[PDB]
């Protein structure tokens, strides 16, 4: 908890950055500066392949990074604005729960561990598909529902 | 079980279309155009060896798709016209538990997931063996009991 930092544009809030494990991650589609000067001055590696900008956490002064896991069992997860249903290879939320500007928020399991980062979603009718970034035991991978857009 | 996916494709409907997973499914031996427009305009791929036609489900109605699994433990399964006994790897129903024109109906497990779709069956005394479309891991297969007729 309380591991979320704001990313701000010149005239508005644009997205969020999160401290997970040993690295700090933000969506590459979010254009702005991190509110925390300690992270704002930190260099990031940009990869358009996964829509990520990542950097190492100054753990010597930032020991409050969240716990994380590569495990993705079926069930419900906590994504701040409510519960998210996970089944198969997709995360699903209520249609009125999602919004633009919410990108960068992590999804937590029942142990408080981060499993994925939210980039956006797609309207599937009664439910909205959630577009997220997750990882396996070795490397990071991205999940992109059809018709999904950045938030 | 408590949900209806069985869309009529003709006025004098013979069999029904349904939404399973991410694909629209109907028997390949039944003529007519699927109603409700959104499915009517879909192109379908036909395979004469499976008696099955399939098309991609439109994103906006994807949330209404039925749950799907390849798991097929021995036991009882449900459908809109009664129960189904699964024994020896084969699905069987009581004679008179269904008629021609009732095809295209999914068979559901105890979690409400689709395991098979009915095409027809063979009437042997008090019990009828069903001809069904079913799935294994990453493959579609068909079961056709001897003497089975199309429904």
């Amino acid at each position: 908890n309380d591991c979320i930092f704001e990313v701000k544009h010149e005239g508005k809030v644009t997205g969020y950055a999160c401290l997970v494990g040993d690295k700090v991650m933000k969506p590459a589609h979010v254009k702005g500066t991190i509110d925390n000067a300690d992270l704002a001055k930190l260099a990031f590696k940009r990869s358009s392949k996964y829509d990520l900008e990542c950097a190492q956490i100054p753990v010597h002064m930032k020991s409050d990074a969240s716990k994380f896991t590569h495990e993705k069992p079926e069930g419900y997860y906590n994504w701040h604005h409510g519960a998210v249903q996970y089944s198969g290879g997709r995360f699903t939320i209520p249609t009125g729960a999602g919004k633009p500007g919410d990108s960068g928020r992590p999804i937590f399991d029942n142990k408080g561990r981060v499993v994925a980062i939210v980039l956006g979603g797609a309207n599937e009718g009664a439910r909205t598909a959630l577009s997220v970034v997750t990882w396996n035991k070795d490397i990071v991978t991205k999940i992109t529902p059809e018709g999904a857009e950045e938030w | 079980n408590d949900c209806i996916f069985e869309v009529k494709h003709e006025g004098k409907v013979t069999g029904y279309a349904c939404l399973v997973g991410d694909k629209v499914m109907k028997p390949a031996h039944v003529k007519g155009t699927i109603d409700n427009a959104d499915l009517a305009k879909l192109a379908f791929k036909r395979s004469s060896k499976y008696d099955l036609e399939c098309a991609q489900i439109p994103v906006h109605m994807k949330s209404d798709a039925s749950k799907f699994t390849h798991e097929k433990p021995e036991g009882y399964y449900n459908w809109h016209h009664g129960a189904v006994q699964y024994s020896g790897g084969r699905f069987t129903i009581p004679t008179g538990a269904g008629k021609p024109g009732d095809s295209g109906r999914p068979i559901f497990d105890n979690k409400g997931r689709v395991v098979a779709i009915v095409l027809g069956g063979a009437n042997e005394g008090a019990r009828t063996a069903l001809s069904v479309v079913t799935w294994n891991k990453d493959i579609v297969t068909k079961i056709t009991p001897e003497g089975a007729e199309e429904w």
Binding site: - | K49, I139, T141, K142
Partner: protein, 48 residues
Amino acid sequence: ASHTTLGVQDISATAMSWVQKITGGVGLVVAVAALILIVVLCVSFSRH
């Protein structure tokens, strides 16, 4: 003429390997395409 006629398709000049190369090239494309279809049909046949 002191000789007889040249009237057969068989008596085309040498350096006609161009004909054999083109014919062989097209025949090879057919032979390969035929094999691809045969293998797929065999796999499809075995699957039920």
